[PDB]
Amino acid sequence: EQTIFDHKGNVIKTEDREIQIISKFEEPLIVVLGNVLSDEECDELIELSKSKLAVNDIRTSSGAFLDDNELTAKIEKRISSIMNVPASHGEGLHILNYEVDQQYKAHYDYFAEHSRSAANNRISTLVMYLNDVEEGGETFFPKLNLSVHPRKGMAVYFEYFYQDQSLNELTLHGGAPVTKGEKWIATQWVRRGTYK
Amino acid sequence: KEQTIFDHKGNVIKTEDREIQIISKFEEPLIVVLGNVLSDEECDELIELSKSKLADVNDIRTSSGAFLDDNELTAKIEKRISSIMNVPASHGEGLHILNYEVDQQYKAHYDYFAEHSRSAANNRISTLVMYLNDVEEGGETFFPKLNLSVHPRKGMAVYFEYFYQDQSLNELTLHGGAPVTKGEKWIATQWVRRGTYK
16 A cells, blocks of 8 residues: 655656656556666666676576676665665666567566565566667566556666555566567666665 | 557657657557657747637636647647557647646546537547646646556657447546646647547
């Protein structure tokens, strides 16, 4: 019933950037956000991931974990304002990329009840689109019949810390195949308690 | 009920004069949030035109809207809109401008006419709402049966359609305008009919 995300109105004023609230799906809460990252910040995250990863599935699963520097600290501070959870609960920015004919099957961001990580589980996600995708790559929620299309600098926030578990399961989401171009995203996954 | 009128796949709609962004889709009934629909200048011009048209207690501003006279600007915008909606501008009612001050809203309603209306014989099938300014606080377009809201953002738009065979899908397009609590909200609408209109 109550959400972690606690922002009314049309903008979120962070210390260094005014974020636009574009659309909300109210329960489970999914929010499309504009002006989250500058174009330069998007390009820098992509550059850092290419440098960090210089036959696994890192690019499409766990993501390139960026080493802490001022850029990551700056962005993590901003997104802590958006998500209403301290950056100390975040896993840190992870960069994923999908080429033509790559996708991800619909899944939950939270860990399974049996899981090693389930004792301090994820509670919310921010997905930041780092580039424009020529065709495909939408983030889709199949139990809600909702999709969000990539747009450079925008993001989708969603949360899954409800007492009613069915609300958490409604956040099942996949990445539709890229059919032209490429898709780059950054994620911040945040835990219930502090992380590392 | 299965197919939609809106027929655009991918992430952009390339019109003759502007690339429109597809931001988000609620799939059925179809509601699409669109970016880059109107330039900043076009938004400001439409607001100015409506002020000119309206120049003693009638509710034109919050109901039917200022109907802009057909000129170069309205024809250009209506052509662009026709590409987005996949329905010729000849089916449109023409751009109507509405504005909401603090503590003004609209109760959730359907855009299509009721069965009893003379207008139901050539009913509305789809709507485009274009946000012409930024709204300091409030003013969201909300769909209460779907738990979806779209917040005003200058130059963006919300498209939705209600020409399904299953009437329950059309009824899910019930939508309202939440009160403005700070600033003011300006919108342009294009309502499209099944057949040609005037």
